[PDB]
Amino acid sequence: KPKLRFIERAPLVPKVRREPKNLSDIRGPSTEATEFTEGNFAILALGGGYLHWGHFEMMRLTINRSMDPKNMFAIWRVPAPFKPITRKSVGHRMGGGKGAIDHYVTPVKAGRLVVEMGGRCEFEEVQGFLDQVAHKLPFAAKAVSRGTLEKMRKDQEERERNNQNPWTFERIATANMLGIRKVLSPYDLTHKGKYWGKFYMPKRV
Amino acid sequence: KNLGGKSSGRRQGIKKMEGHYVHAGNIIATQRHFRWHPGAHVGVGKNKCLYALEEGIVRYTKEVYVPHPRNTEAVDLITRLPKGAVLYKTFVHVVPAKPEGTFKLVAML
Amino acid sequence: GTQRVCLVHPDVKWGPGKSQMTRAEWQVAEATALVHTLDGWSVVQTMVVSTKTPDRKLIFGKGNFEHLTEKIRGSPDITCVFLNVERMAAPTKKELEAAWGVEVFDRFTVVLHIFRCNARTKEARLQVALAEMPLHRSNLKRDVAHLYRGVGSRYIMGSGESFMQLQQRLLREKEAKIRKALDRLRKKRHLLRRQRTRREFPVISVVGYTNCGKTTLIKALTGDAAIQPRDQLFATLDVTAHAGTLPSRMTVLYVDTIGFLSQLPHGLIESFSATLEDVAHSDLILHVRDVSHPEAELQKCSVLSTLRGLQLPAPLLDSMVEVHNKVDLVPGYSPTEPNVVPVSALRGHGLQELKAELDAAVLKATGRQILTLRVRLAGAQLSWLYKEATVQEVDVIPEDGAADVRVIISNSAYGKFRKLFP
Amino acid sequence: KFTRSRIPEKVFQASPEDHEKYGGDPQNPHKLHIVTRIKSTRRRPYWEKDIIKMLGLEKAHTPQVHKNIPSVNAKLKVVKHLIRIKPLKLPQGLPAEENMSNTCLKSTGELVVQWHLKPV
RNA sequence: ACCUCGGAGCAGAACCCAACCUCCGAGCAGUACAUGCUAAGACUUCACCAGUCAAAGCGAACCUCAAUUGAUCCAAUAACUUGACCAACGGAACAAGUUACCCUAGGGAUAACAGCGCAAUCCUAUUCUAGAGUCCAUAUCAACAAUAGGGUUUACGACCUCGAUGUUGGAUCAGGACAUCCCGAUGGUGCAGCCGCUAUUAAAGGUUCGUUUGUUCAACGAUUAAAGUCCUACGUGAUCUGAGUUCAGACCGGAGUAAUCCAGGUCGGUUUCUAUCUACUUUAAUUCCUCCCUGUACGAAAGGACAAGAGAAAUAAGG
RNA sequence: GUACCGUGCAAAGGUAGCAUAAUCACUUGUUCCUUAAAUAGGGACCUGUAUGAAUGGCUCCACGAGGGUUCAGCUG
RNA sequence: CCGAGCCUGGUGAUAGCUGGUUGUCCAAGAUAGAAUCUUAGUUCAACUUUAAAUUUGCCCACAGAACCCUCUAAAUCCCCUUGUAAAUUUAACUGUUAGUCCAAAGAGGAACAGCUCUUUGGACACUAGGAAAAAACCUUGUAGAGAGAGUAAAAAAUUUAACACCCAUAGUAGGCCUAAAAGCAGCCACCAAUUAAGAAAGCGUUCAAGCUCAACACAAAAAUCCCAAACAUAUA
Numbered sequence A: 001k002p003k004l005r006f007i008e009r010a011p012l013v014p015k016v017r018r019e020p021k022n023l024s025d026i027r028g029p030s031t032e033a034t035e036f037t038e039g040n041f042a043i044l045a046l047g048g049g050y051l052h053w054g055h056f057e058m059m060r061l062t063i064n065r066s067m068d069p070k071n072m073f074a075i076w077r078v079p080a081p082f083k084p085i086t087r088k089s090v091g092h093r094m095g096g097g098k099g100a101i102d103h104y105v106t107p108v109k110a111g112r113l114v115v116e117m118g119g120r121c122e123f124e125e126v127q128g129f130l131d132q133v134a135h136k137l138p139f140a141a142k143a144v145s146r147g148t149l150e151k152m153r154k155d156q157e158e159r160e161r162n163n164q165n166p167w168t169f170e171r172i173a174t175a176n177m178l179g180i181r182k183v184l185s186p187y188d189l190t191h192k193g194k195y196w197g198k199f200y201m202p203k204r205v
Numbered sequence B: 001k002n003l004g005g006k007s008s009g010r011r012q013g014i015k016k017m018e019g020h021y022v023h024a025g026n027i028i029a030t031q032r033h034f035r036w037h038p039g040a041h042v043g044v045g046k047n048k049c050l051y052a053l054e055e056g057i058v059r060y061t062k063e064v065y066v067p068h069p070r071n072t073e074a075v076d077l078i079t080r081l082p083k084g085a086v087l088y089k090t091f092v093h094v095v096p097a098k099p100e101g102t103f104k105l106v107a108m109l
Numbered sequence C: 001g002t003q004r005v006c007l008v009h010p011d012v013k014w015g016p017g018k019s020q021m022t023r024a025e026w027q028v029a030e031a032t033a034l035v036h037t038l039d040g041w042s043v044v045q046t047m048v049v050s051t052k053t054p055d056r057k058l059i060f061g062k063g064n065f066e067h068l069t070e071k072i073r074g075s076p077d078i079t080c081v082f083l084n085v086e087r088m089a090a091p092t093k094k095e096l097e098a099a100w101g102v103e104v105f106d107r108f109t110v111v112l113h114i115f116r117c118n119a120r121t122k123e124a125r126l127q128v129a130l131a132e133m134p135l136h137r138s139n140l141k142r143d144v145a146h147l148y149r150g151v152g153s154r155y156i157m158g159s160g161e162s163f164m165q166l167q168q169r170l171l172r173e174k175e176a177k178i179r180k181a182l183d184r185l186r187k188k189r190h191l192l193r194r195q196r197t198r199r200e201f202p203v204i205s206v207v208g209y210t211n212c213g214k215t216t217l218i219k220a221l222t223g224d225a226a227i228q229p230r231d232q233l234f235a236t237l238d239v240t241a242h243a244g245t246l247p248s249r250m251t252v253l254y255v256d257t258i259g260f261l262s263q264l265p266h267g268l269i270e271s272f273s274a275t276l277e278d279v280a281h282s283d284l285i286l287h288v289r290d291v292s293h294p295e296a297e298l299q300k301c302s303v304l305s306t307l308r309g310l311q312l313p314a315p316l317l318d319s320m321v322e323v324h325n326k327v328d329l330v331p332g333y334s335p336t337e338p339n340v341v342p343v344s345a346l347r348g349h350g351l352q353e354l355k356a357e358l359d360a361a362v363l364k365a366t367g368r369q370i371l372t373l374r375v376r377l378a379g380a381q382l383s384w385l386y387k388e389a390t391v392q393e394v395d396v397i398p399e400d401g402a403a404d405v406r407v408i409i410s411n412s413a414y415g416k417f418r419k420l421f422p
Numbered sequence D: 001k002f003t004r005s006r007i008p009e010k011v012f013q014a015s016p017e018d019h020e021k022y023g024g025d026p027q028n029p030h031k032l033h034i035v036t037r038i039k040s041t042r043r044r045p046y047w048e049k050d051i052i053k054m055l056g057l058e059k060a061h062t063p064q065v066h067k068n069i070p071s072v073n074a075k076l077k078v079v080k081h082l083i084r085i086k087p088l089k090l091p092q093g094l095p096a097e098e099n100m101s102n103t104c105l106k107s108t109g110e111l112v113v114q115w116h117l118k119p120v
Numbered sequence E: 001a002c003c004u005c006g007g008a009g010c011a012g013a014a015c016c017c018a019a020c021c022u023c024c025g026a027g028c029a030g031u032a033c034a035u036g037c038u039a040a041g042a043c044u045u046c047a048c049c050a051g052u053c054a055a056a057g058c059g060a061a062c063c064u065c066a067a068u069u070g071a072u073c074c075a076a077u078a079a080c081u082u083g084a085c086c087a088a089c090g091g092a093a094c095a096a097g098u099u100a101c102c103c104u105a106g107g108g109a110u111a112a113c114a115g116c117g118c119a120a121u122c123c124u125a126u127u128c129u130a131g132a133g134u135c136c137a138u139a140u141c142a143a144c145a146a147u148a149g150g151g152u153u154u155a156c157g158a159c160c161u162c163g164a165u166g167u168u169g170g171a172u173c174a175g176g177a178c179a180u181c182c183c184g185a186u187g188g189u190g191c192a193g194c195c196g197c198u199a200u201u202a203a204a205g206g207u208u209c210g211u212u213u214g215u216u217c218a219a220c221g222a223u224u225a226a227a228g229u230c231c232u233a234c235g236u237g238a239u240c241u242g243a244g245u246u247c248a249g250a251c252c253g254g255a256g257u258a259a260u261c262c263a264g265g266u267c268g269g270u271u272u273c274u275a276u277c278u279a280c281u282u283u284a285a286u287u288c289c290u291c292c293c294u295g296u297a298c299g300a301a302a303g304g305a306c307a308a309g310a311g312a313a314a315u316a317a318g319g
Numbered sequence F: 001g002u003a004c005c006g007u008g009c010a011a012a013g014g015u016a017g018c019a020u021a022a023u024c025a026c027u028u029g030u031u032c033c034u035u036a037a038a039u040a041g042g043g044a045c046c047u048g049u050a051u052g053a054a055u056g057g058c059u060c061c062a063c064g065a066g067g068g069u070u071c072a073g074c075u076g
Numbered sequence G: 001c002c003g004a005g006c007c008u009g010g011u012g013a014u015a016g017c018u019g020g021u022u023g024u025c026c027a028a029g030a031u032a033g034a035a036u037c038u039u040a041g042u043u044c045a046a047c048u049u050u051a052a053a054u055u056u057g058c059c060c061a062c063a064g065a066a067c068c069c070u071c072u073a074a075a076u077c078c079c080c081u082u083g084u085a086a087a088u089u090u091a092a093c094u095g096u097u098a099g100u101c102c103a104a105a106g107a108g109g110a111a112c113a114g115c116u117c118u119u120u121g122g123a124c125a126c127u128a129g130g131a132a133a134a135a136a137c138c139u140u141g142u143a144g145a146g147a148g149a150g151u152a153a154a155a156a157a158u159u160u161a162a163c164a165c166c167c168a169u170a171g172u173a174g175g176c177c178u179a180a181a182a183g184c185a186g187c188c189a190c191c192a193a194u195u196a197a198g199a200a201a202g203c204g205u206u207c208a209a210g211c212u213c214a215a216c217a218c219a220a221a222a223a224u225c226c227c228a229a230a231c232a233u234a235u236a
């Protein structure tokens, strides 16, 4: 079963309790599915966002059509949509209670792998349609190999080491210099200024 | 569809932290469940509130938990605990300050 | 959305509505197939109920209506009710909904919903929007009740039009926009047809009742693989042309079409005229008949009425070549009417005979002449004939350095040939 | 929520490079700080306002002498973004009762005990 | 729909925290009759009321439960004690509809118009290269999606205006944008020619008259080169009209016992203002058609052009 | 069950008549006449489950500053 | 001027509603909630003011404050020193209890709103300077005169797409399939000759033929009319 598996619109056992839109699940760096497993290539999410069944279908169809089943295999690195998003009836005034469950999404944080590919192939053979899918994804995304991912991580480390700026967001925020914690967020003490909402600034050091 | 849930906060919790001088009868902490267990010179009310039985200094410690043999649920928990495991709970003690009393010369018969 | 449905079939037993070609069991089976096609929910319960008078605010006589009310309200599994009727008026819908405490759907609404669900192309989406406009206009009352908010006749300012009346105005403009968009779509489809019309590709429009195997037959004839027939109803929801060769080595475009159902508002199917006009601009029409289906005659009537309403040219209506599909399901089937071809698309049984018959029909209908023509070799005339006509047999006369070619050639190509190579 | 900021301890652990840069030996640390409020307490939390008032730094650009002891240092850490801290230097040592009236705090941070207002 | 009480999230860690926010529950039950009497010290639902825990002592033996409830007065009782889904649950001892016949005090603290925020909705443009287009992503489109832009709709918000910002259509006059309907220039075409389709540029000029309907629109009739999409307080009522809507009258269907009412229909129904201020009040033309080109180029035919030339008009401006 | 043949219930099951009505909406109902063109007007309909008989129903003589439509003429 | 006349009187009716509420000067002064036929109000609390009594008030070192829950934050509570000078209590009161934006953690909405609702903090409802004009962003506040002085915050930067040249014989029209499908309609195989060439990655042929390729070799647009003028180079 090398081809990418079908993803259901909603969990077979639908959720009954409406739950809040905890955007923290999109905010910040991803702590899961950050490393390769049984594969050499992937789509890395350089930003946070919610994946719908439409995005899942786009990924599945594009990758299945463009891959070579006898030499390539793909695997989801993100769970099927589980977080329920509720929408009220069109033109409804505010109030009256939380809306009914409309769709299901799956959160994705910056730095996560969405799909992972492997098999008897090199990067150039796959990067094309992986970049197509990444560009059509709801967040910034990039087709990345193991080598390229390691290269970008090492480049980030090198920039952090050799930056000539005496002042770093990390230092200033941690020391509360200028009292900038009045303007910053508690999440910023760990994001180090590289994250802003759902957006991940990679050039940011 | 969602009714109720308007109850206010019980204002429960610790009323006397460690190092606080506490007179006899003072309520040290009010709790819904057994968060802090009664230590030395600390009594429990019907509602699990801890009150000082003596006049002294409140001290919070971590002590091994040995439930009463007739406390069936706790005894079952222990019976299922692996060998070498020891339960610990937070206990509140009142280290009495004054002595029970003094012997005073009342009459030189 | 995951809506267990109770099927209610009003069986008319006297007067108008007493169908003489179909039975309540067959109609119930068709409605069950419709809901299964709609997918995601099933008929939790089925109820066929007599109705001497089918036209009422409550389709059923008070007694049967109360009986159904008791059953529906006592059955908790039921989430919706599907009333097997063409169209139900807003009063009937409102009264039944209030009585039964559920949502009521008629065949019109069910077909509309399946279209909206399984419509992919923007053309299909626009056409189904047009088809929905009737359902909208019917349902504004319920739809915009909550927006109305029980305010009327007391506000003295603004556009004098009431809430309901200005909603009618907005829906009028919405329908006007939809119709303008479909006119633009019709123009674009004419642009698309231009090239094939100029090249004079014979075109055969495959029509018939829904789930007759139109798509399967087109797949069998063309030999394609991307063509995917479905068990569901209303699978083919777009009009597309597929090239296939005939025994005479002639290429023909089979045009797949939307399926037809009986007991539906005409406007529903007629809203797809923007893309079904390819049938009007066809050269032959091939009518597929699921003879195995018990309701074959009723389906015949429905499809013929639908075509007449679509206003295809009468010459095209005539000469409709009839193929009886699904013959394998009916073992030992003997066609009765002449000029009818029994075929089995899945098993590919009578496909050769069908191909020959429709080849003859194309020759008759496209003004194409099969004739023997003598040409000179090395003069490019042979290559020209290959490219601009379908050559069938080349008998070379080496002594004269020439060749007699048996070619099926249209009059336009014949004139071009006679002028280019006198 | 915006809350009081806990400065990690490592921030206040000087390095040899810092010692070279700022001219202060870790051994034999300075006894007294000269602290001047160079920033307004407006738009700052009430706790910082109160700490400034406690330190007596209500007037800006007005040097105040404070002990270089852990508690005063904790307060100064709380309000460090509003003040300039320098080490009080005593080139002629502590002023004596005789010269108590001739002292002056030069901008360099030195409390000279003779102020003649004459050319050198 | 809800109104009182409790538990869990929101509210991760002392306490406390809203929501017509998300979920669960309560209006008891059971056992006991010392669930007897007293009394330090404390807690406290952010007040009070109420509600909690409790050492010691007397007298004895040797309560479970989160909520599980309700004050005062007043009634019953010899007394002890008892009494409300007073659930609008800090509780008027006992009182419903309807008003367009309406009135007063206010409110832009609060709706309808308009403006405004936003852009869900709506519209437009690119990217993606699946799918239509016989073959062919890109002549013309285009699914899943992605990225942008616009502020025409329906909304949503309630920020100015309720010691008045007069309201839909129409007349009059039009100012503006271009995302161009026609006229001009140009690229592509599934551009043979004629019609066309598409895109770039172009806002100087133009963009019809009628039958119903109050209609903006739409349908239809006849035309046109075309009968463009919009903004302008859905431009313009101190310039006009009031047919619709939207007072007071009345009928039909329906609701109600009735008053009276209707997202219903229908007949009628008062359009004020003498201008103080600002502003303003005399600033090389387009298009169609006729003949000819020409029945020519083109085309198998059908049909059928440009350009050049000649002549005619129509509108618009000025006389 | 196949309008008529039985049947349940009711106080009786809306009868005659008229009918897209000044009669909820569907509504610009479907048709024919009328107009070049009609959401208007008039004539009809298995047309009202919200018509209907002194809460009066149908018919038509005259009448009407009532409300529609209209021939011909007339005219800024 | 009749949904019920007019006049007089009760009558200075009542109004939680609107409006108004008149000398000078100084000072303190914006602050949680509860109940309420209550949310346009009021009483209590909180805050605020005044006077008085007394002694601790704020900041805060360790130590200390739960499992459920596997991990799980900014912090908080408590708190000697220390820096400070306020705090509690007593007496008497009013007024505010219709609130805005900003940063942050959230909830509702649509991860819209100058939207709504809580929490921590700030500012504004007060002065001044800046961000153009500017309640809420930044600087800064305790007040007067000065024809002195040092400073605070404080002025946006960006310009982006060229890409080879030469050459191609051939086991053979590899088999099967088909009328034909010969690299190229489809399936299997995909070896192999030449120094070097896929039993062919694209056009093309009905099929062939022919053309190449891989190989040898050398961003944007809206409606009255754009919107300071301009300026790349004289030492921070």
Ligand SMILES: Nc1nc2c(ncn2[C@@H]2O[C@H](COP(=O)(O)OP(=O)(O)OP(=O)(O)O)[C@@H](O)[C@H]2O)c(=O)[nH]1
Pocket (backbone or CB within 6 Å): C209, C210, C211, C212, C213, C214, C215, C216, C217, C228, C229, C230, C231, C232, C233, C234, C235, C236, C237, C258, C259, C260, C325, C326, C327, C328, C329, C344, C345, C346, C347
């Ligand atoms: N032709 C044919 N179809 C059969 C036969 N038996 C079963 N079928 C089914 O008939 C169905 C026909 O599907 P399509 O050919 O897509 O139907 P269609 O006639 O194009 O109609 P739409 O589904 O509306 O597009 C398929 O599910 C077949 O499996 C048979 O003997 N012949």
Ligand SMILES: Nc1nc2c(ncn2[C@@H]2O[C@H](COP(=O)(O)OP(=O)(O)OP(=O)(O)O)[C@@H](O)[C@H]2O)c(=O)[nH]1
Pocket (backbone or CB within 6 Å): E073, E074, E083, E084, E093
């Ligand atoms: N505590 C209490 N007082 C009551 C109760 N019922 C009536 N009352 C008293 O009586 C008042 C109510 O009067 P009603 O409503 O006439 O009482 P009723 O019993 O229904 O009728 P009557 O006996 O005719 O007065 C209350 O406000 C009390 O004063 C009750 O259940 N509990």
Ligand SMILES: [Mg+2]
Pocket (backbone or CB within 6 Å): B005, B006, B007
């Ligand atoms: Mg709670």
Ligand SMILES: [Mg+2]
Pocket (backbone or CB within 6 Å): C213, C214, C215, C216, C229, C230, C235, C236
């Ligand atoms: Mg089909």
Ligand SMILES: [Mg+2]
Pocket (backbone or CB within 6 Å): E044
């Ligand atoms: Mg209290």
Ligand SMILES: [Mg+2]
Pocket (backbone or CB within 6 Å): none
């Ligand atoms: Mg109450």
Ligand SMILES: [Mg+2]
Pocket (backbone or CB within 6 Å): E100
């Ligand atoms: Mg009236």
Ligand SMILES: [Mg+2]
Pocket (backbone or CB within 6 Å): none
């Ligand atoms: Mg009034």
Ligand SMILES: [Mg+2]
Pocket (backbone or CB within 6 Å): none
């Ligand atoms: Mg508005």
Ligand SMILES: [Mg+2]
Pocket (backbone or CB within 6 Å): E108, E158, E159
């Ligand atoms: Mg307002």
Ligand SMILES: [Mg+2]
Pocket (backbone or CB within 6 Å): none
């Ligand atoms: Mg508000």
Ligand SMILES: [Mg+2]
Pocket (backbone or CB within 6 Å): none
């Ligand atoms: Mg005024």
Ligand SMILES: [Mg+2]
Pocket (backbone or CB within 6 Å): none
């Ligand atoms: Mg343009």
Ligand SMILES: [Mg+2]
Pocket (backbone or CB within 6 Å): E234
């Ligand atoms: Mg508008």
Ligand SMILES: [Mg+2]
Pocket (backbone or CB within 6 Å): E242
């Ligand atoms: Mg009127």
Ligand SMILES: [Mg+2]
Pocket (backbone or CB within 6 Å): none
């Ligand atoms: Mg009536």
